[PDB]
Each structure stands twice: as structure tokens, then as C-alpha cells.
Amino acid sequence: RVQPIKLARVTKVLGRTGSQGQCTQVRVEFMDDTSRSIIRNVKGPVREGDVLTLLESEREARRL
Amino acid sequence: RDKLNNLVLFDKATYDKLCKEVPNYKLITPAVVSERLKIRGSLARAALQELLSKGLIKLVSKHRAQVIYTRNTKG
Amino acid sequence: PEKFQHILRVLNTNIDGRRKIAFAITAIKGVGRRYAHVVLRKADIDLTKRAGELTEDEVERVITIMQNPRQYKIPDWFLNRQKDVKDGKYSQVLANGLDNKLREDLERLKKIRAHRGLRHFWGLRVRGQHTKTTGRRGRTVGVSK
Amino acid sequence: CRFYQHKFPEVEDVVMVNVRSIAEMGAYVSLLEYNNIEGMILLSELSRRRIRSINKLIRIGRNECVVVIRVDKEKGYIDLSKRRVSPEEAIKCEDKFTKSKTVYSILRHVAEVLEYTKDEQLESLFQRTAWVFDDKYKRPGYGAYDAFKHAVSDPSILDSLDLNEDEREVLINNINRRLTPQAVKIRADIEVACYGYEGIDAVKEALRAGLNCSTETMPIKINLIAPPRYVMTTTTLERTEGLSVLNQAMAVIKEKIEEKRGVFNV
RNA sequence: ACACCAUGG
RNA sequence: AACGAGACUCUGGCAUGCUAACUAGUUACGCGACCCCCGAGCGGUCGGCGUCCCCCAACUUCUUAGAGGGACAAGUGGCGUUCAGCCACCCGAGAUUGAGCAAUAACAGGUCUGUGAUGCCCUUAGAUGUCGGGGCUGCACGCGCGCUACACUGACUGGCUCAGCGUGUGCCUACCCUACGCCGGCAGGCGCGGGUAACCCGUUGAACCCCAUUCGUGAUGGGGAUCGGGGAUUGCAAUUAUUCCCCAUGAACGAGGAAUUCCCAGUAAGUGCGGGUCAUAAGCUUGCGUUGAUUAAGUCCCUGCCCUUUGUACACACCGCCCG
RNA sequence: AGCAGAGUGGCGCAGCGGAAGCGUGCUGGGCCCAUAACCCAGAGGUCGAUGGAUCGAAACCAUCCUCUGCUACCA
Ligand SMILES: [Mg+2]
Ligand SMILES: [Mg+2]
Ligand SMILES: [Mg+2]
Ligand SMILES: [Mg+2]
Ligand SMILES: [Mg+2]
Ligand SMILES: [Mg+2]
Ligand SMILES: [Mg+2]
Ligand SMILES: [Mg+2]
Ligand SMILES: [Mg+2]
Ligand SMILES: [Mg+2]
Ligand SMILES: [Mg+2]
Ligand SMILES: [Mg+2]
Ligand SMILES: [Mg+2]
Ligand SMILES: [Mg+2]
Ligand SMILES: [Mg+2]
Ligand SMILES: [Mg+2]
Ligand SMILES: [Mg+2]
Ligand SMILES: [Mg+2]
Ligand SMILES: [Mg+2]
Ligand SMILES: [Mg+2]
Ligand SMILES: [Mg+2]
Ligand SMILES: [Mg+2]
Ligand SMILES: [Mg+2]
Ligand SMILES: [Mg+2]
Ligand SMILES: [Mg+2]
Ligand SMILES: [Mg+2]
Ligand SMILES: [Mg+2]
């Protein structure tokens, strides 16, 4: 329940998910060891190269 | 609404407190002086122009919709 | 400065000395803003004073100019009862004569039973406005029996 | 002011709140068994089964009993729930609420006469007097109302510590308009059927002997609901003392009609 | 991993 | 092979290149003149302000409007069966302005009250073909499009400073747009001129905005309904107030329930101005400028649309059919 | 006549002293091409009457009245 914050850099834009097409699937690396990668659903207008902040990085996105 | 019963002109207590606040306030505007005491807000303008005349406060900006003063350009 | 008595009781109405004179005396009927400003200018008193800052030798002059305007060169096109229908006078009717004149005018109209008096009797609109979709005071009517 | 010894609400407590309005994410509410801090019930946290319209199971302006799910004492946040509210908890919550409001309303004459220029008067009076009025039987199961329950039925506690001015004659008046009267129910079942003419003045030797070993004139109830079932109740006392005086009444009154002639029910 | 969704001068 | 799409027409953005202009201007000085030293200086010479006056001065930058030019996914890098094409970037006035026009087939859609378009039926002199008066506006109530507000990112009072699209003397039909002088607080009146118009109103001194005063959280100096009394103009006639002006009265309304409309860049919204109807007159509509955002670069969830496969007891086509 | 329960919106009712709402009915809106269902708002109160306590009640106490169930059933 106690985890620090993790900054993650976006390296690929996959597609638009959600019922209205309202959020985006994005693949990120973890700013500490580039050998890590996860998939997240981002809410805003994400480009490639941006840095997201993760309040919970042990999760992963399935879809929707 | 509500009920804000402000004073139309000073009494001696408020009148001395208005001169005992001069060194204390970093920002002086009519609205702040209205909220500190119970002043009709159009009396606060006259009070601050009077204090300014006596060199007790320093004018930093005057505009139609805003006036700003500060304590003696110090601290 | 000079926390003195403020609440005034001018003829048949209460003025608050907490306000400026030109907007304090408008509390009396028949006296609006355009009238009060002129009545205060003709009386040569200042216009930045609160209505409580007037001693008993100003208020009297203000009201005696307010009640006899044509004496102090207030014009005719400016008074609220001109060519008085039944006496030919020009006057400002001020405080209680206003309601009396209004009721007397309505009763005059109803007496000869003109059309304006009949619209005033039935509580309808006296000018020529449509009444099909405005006014709307009563209650909703049910259509299902 | 504050209604409770605890300044802030704690986790897993049923607070009796007032729904003040509803935002896109939750009903913001006024807590009033505490100070008047703002709280939020989340719209997801509001029911377990599907809701047909919200303007039924909440209406703005109704007090209702909702549990706490999170509190942040650092910056003043309270989160609340209605999924997590039991009917048996619903039994005790407004009990606690009304029993706290009684002690808040008794602490009014004080604010009525004391330094009501500030309301810190009532806060100080609370932390002084009402803080200690409940720490003596709280876990046993009494609030701050037991002290005043005893104040007029057995005045020894208010004088066991500071007693102040013009507050006594207000509380020893008003709580004995409401809490003090005895739960009297003990109508004795006196069933007999005699076959003698003096059978009315044969029990009259005991008709005055409802309560025994006392004064002859002490007030009792003269009852008749049926010729076969006569009825008795005596000096009221408290209902276990009432049962102690009544325990043999059905028998000590019967022991006089059995002796003349005829055998009755015992 | 599927709430409700009837009828027609 | 044909239609529709596209192409096409008008429009907005660019040309210091062309054509050429007292019914448009610029600059120059010929000037001449006013004014102030505001500069060296003296104040003059040099300058500074001018919608003050002239040029048979030189020119077309601004204005006008004609002819041509110019943008093509043309250049460069990626992605593409290396095809059709897509993304990014340099250069550029611009790399996706806005409208007009629009198919086969159809609807018992609207219009007989636009018509000297029209079939049939009715009436036709006690007319269903003309004058006077009333109505189309009446008010317990239900609904639609809208105007003004709920104030301090404001109201009031002064000062300052900027537009564009238009219209303008009428034949029957009798009326147009106004300058400037005087008179009146105001609406308005009298007197003399210009314009059939890039010529006169007009350099269209527009509003919001900008700069200073008074107000002070109070249904208040917010709001302007309702109503009393008076003064003008149009007209043959103003009462059921035509419109306009003045003093007075001073209602609801403190941001709006369930629902629901419109919108992607000079766009939404704020703001004023013209045309239409108009003897009189816009809270309407149709065009024009002025200040000028937040949010998107997506999806098929909701409402619908297009194409393919599939199912059907429907074809008056699911608002269908049909069982007890 | 007696016991017990109840007396609150047209109707069924909730309401352990800081004091008027729920469910149904009624009227008008919403949603739909339209009707039912469903959503919203409005209207309608001597809290049975009379006194008393209480700082204060619809609520507590006392008297009376009116309904309902059950025995009593009574010259
Ligand atoms: Mg259906
Ligand atoms: Mg049926
Ligand atoms: Mg059927
Ligand atoms: Mg059918
Ligand atoms: Mg072919
Ligand atoms: Mg290429
Ligand atoms: Mg460039
Ligand atoms: Mg185009
Ligand atoms: Mg077509
Ligand atoms: Mg036709
Ligand atoms: Mg025909
Ligand atoms: Mg017609
Ligand atoms: Mg004719
Ligand atoms: Mg006629
Ligand atoms: Mg009509
Ligand atoms: Mg329409
Ligand atoms: Mg506006
Ligand atoms: Mg217009
Ligand atoms: Mg015109
Ligand atoms: Mg017009
Ligand atoms: Mg129209
Ligand atoms: Mg829609
Ligand atoms: Mg297609
Ligand atoms: Mg098929
Ligand atoms: Mg068939
Ligand atoms: Mg069907
Ligand atoms: Mg059948």
C-alpha cells in the first residue's frame, strides 16, 4: 500500500480505447531501468516522448 | 444573502486602530481594510487617501478598478 | 468623525442618515433621483455629505424647497402633476397626497365608467398589451375529468 | 460547536449527517454530531443494488445516518458510506445523536447568559464539563446523559465536582419533565369467586393491606375491571421495589377469603 | 461473461 | 458508355511587376499663411503641427478595377505489394477559406389565399363582385422561437479614440437622404443649400473596449415590469394607450427540476450598424464590420446514415404480422 | 359498559423533546411518432378536542370524544 512515484516515458502510441474513443493505449519505460516496459491507458492528448507520472505502477492496462 | 452592518464613518476606537495597523500590513487595498474592521468600504478609500497624504503609506499602483499601497517601502 | 444621530423622520416617512442625501431623500415618494438632485442643487447645500451630517437648519430648507418648487425656479416640465385635471395647478405631490391623487384619478375614471376605469375594476391590463400569455396569476386548470 | 468528545470523526463510525448538496462525484454533507465540517458520500459508495433515480435514496435537506470510510486530519477530508450502514447500527446511531443533542441543548442556558459574545464560551464549557461527564461509564454503556439522569434522581455527581451558577435549577427542572417517570405496569391478577354475603367485607380486612408493614393511609389503587378478577397496585417506588411489595399481594389478599368458606385459586 | 425494453386510426 | 462526385462560377488571402485616374490619393516643394519655441538659434535660416489654400509639379505605395501571374502533393525525409496514395518538414501570401449549382426514383408533404395557371361543383342582384362601424389584440390555463436581467470581470457621470456591407427624390403611387444658421430642457419647429450620387449627408467622430470620478454586498445607486400626470410628430381618423419625450410609481428575479439545442478558428460569445416590411414604426429576419477565448485532431457508446454477408410467417414493408 | 390498539396531506402511515415527512391518490410538465411503464415538480396539515408540566412538543401527564379487534352480553 506504500509505494513511491514512478516517472515513465512514452515510446509508442498504440490506439484509442474506451467506449467513446476517449483514452489512448501507450507503452512506457520507467526512467530508471530502460529495460522495463508497461502498457497504460492515458486520458489526455498524449504525444510520443512525454513523461507521465504513475501513482500506481504495479498495475497494467487490459482495455477499456 | 447575509447582513454586513458596516460603519459609515469612524469612531475613536476604529480610528486609532486604523493608524495602529499601518506598519503591520504588507498589502493595503480598500477591500482588505473593509474586511479587517467593519467599514463601509467607501470610507476605506477616504481613510487610505488621508493616510497617504500624511506619508504613513506608499502608493504602488493606482487604477480606476484597483488601488494598492504598501508599508513605507521597507522589510 | 462626529458619530451623531442619523435616523431622520421627515414628513410621514423614515430616512436613514447612513446614506448620501441625494439618495437618502429618494426614500420619500414623489422624489426620485432626477428630482432630488435638483432640489439639493437649488438649496446650495453640498452633495458629498451623508444624510446624517445635516443639522436642523438645512433639512427644513431642503423640504420647504421640495414642497414649493416653482418658488425656487424649478421648471414646470419637471413636476409630477402638471395642469392638475380639476384645478389647473402645477405641483409635485410628494408623500401621502400621491396615493390620494392616484385613487382619486382611478375613482374619477370609474365614476363616468370610461374604459380605463373598467379595466382597473376587473384587475386587467390598462394599456394595450396582449393578455393571452402574460400576467398569469391564477392556478393551473386540469383537462382530465 | 462540537457535539462529541472527539473533535474529528474516526474511521468506522456512524455519523448522523445532514446532506447539504450533491456534486458530480458525491453528496457533500454537514456532519453535526461533531463540528460542522464538510464531508462527501461518493455516488458509487451510496448503494449495492442498481439505483433508478438518486433523488429518492438521497434528498438534499434530510438528516441520515452514514458511516465513515476515511478521514484525513492533516487537511480536513472526510469520506462517508451508505453501503456500509446496518439496520442494527441504524438503531443505535440516532440514539447517540439525540443523546448528544440533549447535552448540546442543556448547554444553552449557559450560552444564553454567559459570555455569548464569542462562541468559544460554549467550546470551553464543553471541554470543561461535558468532556468528563461521559468518561466514567462510557465502556459500561453510558454517555454524558447518565450524569444528568442521576442529577435529579440522586444528586451526588454534579456536586462531586464543580457546580456552577444558575445552571442547576435549569437542568433539575427540565430533565424531570422527560426521563424520570416510572414504567408502572404491575396490575396484580386477583381471581376469586366466593359464595358468602360478607365476602366483600371479609377481604376488606386485607383490602387495606396491599402493602404490609406500612402506614394505613398510604395511597394505593382501588381497582375493579371484573367482579371475578379484582386488581391491585400499591406504593410506586421503582418497579423492582414495586414487584417486592406486590410479590405476595395476590396471596396476602387471598388468605382472608380462603378461611371463611369455599376453596379458591392460589 | 447478457438489468429493464409491452402495444399500434 | 451515360448521369451524379470532381471539374465549373462567385468570393477571401498575395504582386512596390503591367494598364491609369482633380468623381481617389501620395510625396515633393512652388508655395502662401496660422500658430507656438517646442530645437540649434532670436523669434529670423534650419526645423515641429495642419482634412489651412494653391500646382498646366512628379508619381500610383496606400484607393479604385481590368489583364496576366501564382499551388501542382511541385521539393526533401519516412511509410507504402514501393502502384494508388498517407505523415512530417524547408521555401511561401498560402500546403485542409466560404458559398452557388446538383442525379435516378418517390411522398396522396405544402400551396386552388401569388397568377388574366387551371378541371369539376357552388353562388350570381334579397350576391359569395362596394362604403361606415367592430374583429383578427378579448384571458382561469398548456406549449414554441426570443429580448432584458439576476450586478463589483458591475452600474452611474465625464473625457478619449477606431469600421464595413448598404440605401437615397417614385411613371399609376406623390413619399427620398440630409448639411448648416436660428428657436426649444427634450421629442421637435422655422429658414436656406447639396445630391438621380467614388461628386452631397460623409474623413460615415457607432457601440463594446480605453482613462478618471461616486457607489459598497444591503432586492442597493442591480433590474425595469406595472401604473398616474403632462408635451410633440405621422395620418382622413390614435379610444382597446401607433410611435417619441419629460417628472413620478419601483413587481418578479440572488444563476434556474426532470429534460434539451447549437457549435472547431477570426469560428462560439459580447457589440453596434445597414437592407427588407416602412404615411408612422423592430424585441423579427437578411447582410456587415468590431473585440475575440476554453476545448478536439477522436470514436461508434447514444441518435442516425452508407456498403457486404446473413435470417424472415413482413410487402399498407416492425408504426408489420400475429396466439389464447 | 369494559380491555387493548389507533387518531398526522383525499387515503394507508413513519415521526424515542431543538419539531411536517413517506407510500398511494390528485393536477401539470419530461421522455416517445403515440399510449402504458418510467423521471420531475406542484397542490392539499386545527398533528382528535380541552387544560397542565417543560426554556421549548404532534410526542409527556390528566379529562373527554371518535374508529377497529376481542370477551362482557348486562331486569
Ligand atoms: Mg418500441
Ligand atoms: Mg393490448
Ligand atoms: Mg392485440
Ligand atoms: Mg396496423
Ligand atoms: Mg467502366
Ligand atoms: Mg515522397
Ligand atoms: Mg516559413
Ligand atoms: Mg471549397
Ligand atoms: Mg439529389
Ligand atoms: Mg397554386
Ligand atoms: Mg379551382
Ligand atoms: Mg395568405
Ligand atoms: Mg373592391
Ligand atoms: Mg370595411
Ligand atoms: Mg394574428
Ligand atoms: Mg422557427
Ligand atoms: Mg448586453
Ligand atoms: Mg438589424
Ligand atoms: Mg427609410
Ligand atoms: Mg427599419
Ligand atoms: Mg416575420
Ligand atoms: Mg439532438
Ligand atoms: Mg460506404
Ligand atoms: Mg437475403
Ligand atoms: Mg403478404
Ligand atoms: Mg410490434
Ligand atoms: Mg384477439
Q: Is B13 on the interface with C (CB under 8 A)?
A: no
Distance CA D266, CA D263 (A): 9
Scored b (16 or more CB within 10 A) or e, D200-210 reads: eebbeebbebb
Residue labelled with grid coordinates 530508471: A32
Task: Tell me the sheet residues that pair with C50.
Answer: C20
> From CA C59, how far away is CA C22, in angstroms rounded?
12
Q: What are phi and psi of D176, to 5 degrees?
A: -85, 10
| Radius of gyration, CA atoms only, chain D | 28
Judge if C7 and C70 occupy the same domain.
Answer: yes
Q: B5 CB near a chain C CB, below 8 Å?
A: no
C86 and C57 in one domain? no
Instruction: Please state, in angstroms and rounded to a whole number, the distance separating the CA atoms of residues C29 and C101.
Output: 13
**Residue C41 domain boundaries:** 1-75
Round and report the angstrom distance from CA (C35) to C1' (F310).
Answer: 87
Domain boundary among C20, C48, C75: C75
Enter the DSSP assignment of D62. -
Interatomic distance D183 CA / G73 C1' (Å)? 34
The C-alpha atoms of residue D1 and residue D119 are separated, in whole angstroms, by: 8
Q: Does residue C6 sit in the same domain as residue C67?
A: yes
| Rounded-to-integer distance, Cα C1 and Cα B72, Å | 26
Task: Give the CA distances from residue D177 to residues D143, D166, D173, D236, in Å, rounded to whole numbers and listed in that order.
Answer: 20, 18, 7, 18
Q: Is residue C145 part of a domain?
A: no
CA atoms within 13 A on the CB side of C56: 2
Q: Which three cell numbers stand for residue D175?
A: 430533565
Q: Tell me the Ramachandran region of residue C119: left when phi exceeds 0, alpha when psi lies from -120 to 50, beta otherwise.
A: alpha
CATH architecture entry for B1-75? Orthogonal Bundle (1.10)
Q: Do C41 and C19 share a domain, yes or no? A: yes
Helix, coil or strand: residue A42? strand
Burial of C13 (0-12, 13-18, 19+ CB in 10 A): middle
The rounded Cα C142 to chain-centroid distance in angstroms is 43
Residue in B7, B67, B64 with CA at minimum distance from that of residue B31: B67
Distance CA(C119)–CA(D191), nearest Å, equals 85
B11–chain C Cβ distance below 8 A for any pair: yes
- HSE of D207, CA atoms in CB hemisphere, 13 A: 11
The CA distance from B11 to C3, in Å, is 7
The structural domain count of chain C equals 2
Cα–Cα dist D18/D61, whole Å: 6
Q: What is the Cα–Cα distance from D138 to D140, expressed in whole angstroms?
A: 5
SS3 C25: helix
Interface probe for C, chosen from B7, B9, B43 (most Cβ of C below 10 Å), is B9
- Assess whether D139 (CB) lies less than 7 A from strand G: no
Pair B68, B58: CB distance under 8 Å: no
Shortest Cα distance, chain C CAs vs residue B75, angstroms: 33
Residue pointed to by grid coordinates 432626477: C34
DSSP states along D73-135? TTTTEEEEESTT--HHHHHHHHHHHHHHHHHHHHTTHHHHHS-TTSSHHHHHHIIIIITTSST
Bridge partners for B6 per DSSP: none
Q: Are residues C44 and C88 in the same domain?
A: no
The B 6-45 residues near strand F by Cβ under 7 Å are 6, 30-31, 34, 40-42, 45
Residues C47 and C98 in one domain: no
C50 to B9: CB separation less than 8 angstroms, yes or no: yes
* Residue whose grid cell is 478609500: B45
DSSP state string for D138-174:
TTTT--THHHHHHHHHS--SSTTS---SSSHHHHHHH
Residues C44 and C96 in one domain: no
Hunting for cell 396582449 — which residue is that?
C130
- Three cell numbers written together for D249: 399481594
Q: How far apart, in whole angstroms, are the C-alpha atoms of residue D232 and residue D225?
A: 11
Q: For cell 405496569, name the residue.
A: D185
B4–C contact, CB cutoff 8 A: no
CB of B31 within 8 A of CB of B12?
A: no
Q: H/E element holding D234?
A: none
Half-sphere exposure of residue C119: CA atoms within 13 angstroms, side-chain side:
10
Amino acid symbol at C118: L
Instruction: Answer yes or no: is C90 within a domain.
Output: yes
State how far the Cα of C36 lies from the Cα of C66, in Å rounded to an integer.
8
Non-local (6+) Cβ contacts of D95 within 8 A are none
- Looking at C58, C75, C92, the residue that finishes a domain is C75
Whether C86 and C116 map to the same domain: the answer is yes
User: From CA C59, how far away is CA C55, in angstroms rounded?
Assistant: 7
- DSSP secondary structure code for residue D254 in this structure: G
Residue C3 sits in the same domain as residue C53 = yes
Q: Name the nearest CA neighbour of D85 among D76, D73, D93, D77.
A: D93
CB of C133 within 7 Å of some strand G atom: no
Single residue among C75, C106, C123 that ends a domain in this structure:
C75
| 3-state DSSP assignment of residue A18 | coil
Residues D146 and D102 sit within 8 Å (Cβ to Cβ): no
Euclidean distance between CA atoms D237 and D240, whole angstroms: 8
| CA C89 from centre of chain | 18
CB contact under 8 A, C2 and B9: yes
Nearest nucleotide over every DNA/RNA strand to the D169 CA, judged by C1': G55
- Cα separation, B75 vs B27, in Å, equals 13
Residue C109 near residue C122, CB atoms below 8 Å: no
D19 touches strand G (CB under 7 A): no
Using CA atoms, how far residue B26 sits from B1, B64, B69, B71, D108, in Å, is 31, 21, 8, 6, 41
Resolution of the determined structure in angstroms stands at 3.0
Distance, in Å, from the CA atom of A5 to the CA atom of D170, rounded to the nearest integer, reads 60
CB A53 within 8 A of CB A43: no
- Say yes or no: C95 and C53 in one domain: no
Instruction: Examine the domain organization and report whether C62 and C132 are in the same domain.
Output: no
Separation between Cα atoms, residue D166 and residue D19, nearest integer Å: 37
Phi and psi, residue B56, nearest 5°: -75, -20
> Domains of chain A (ranges plus CATH)?
3-64 (2.40.50.140)
Q: How far is Cα C13 from Cα C25, in angstroms, rounded to an integer?
A: 10
- If DSSP codes are grouped into helix, strand and coil, which group holds residue D47? coil
Instruction: Indicate if C5 and C33 belong to the same structural domain.
Output: yes
User: What ranges do the domains of chain B cover?
Assistant: 1-75
User: What whole-number distance in Å separates Cα of residue C116 and Cα of residue C105?
Assistant: 11
Residues of B in contact with C52 (CB under 8 A): 8
Give the Cα separation of D79 and D93 in Å (integer): 18
Paired strand residues for A52: A8
Cα-based torsion angle of the residue sequence B58, B63, B67, B71 in order, rounded to the nearest 10 degrees: -20
Looking at beta carbons, which pairs linking B3-8 to residues 24 or more positions away fall under 8 Å? Answer: B5/B38, B6/B34, B6/B38, B6/B39, B6/B40, B6/B41, B7/B37, B7/B38, B7/B39, B7/B40, B7/B43, B8/B40, B8/B43, B8/C6, B8/C18, B8/C50, B8/C52
Experimental method: cryo-EM
Minimal CA separation from C2 to chain B, in Å: 8
DSSP state letter for C78: T
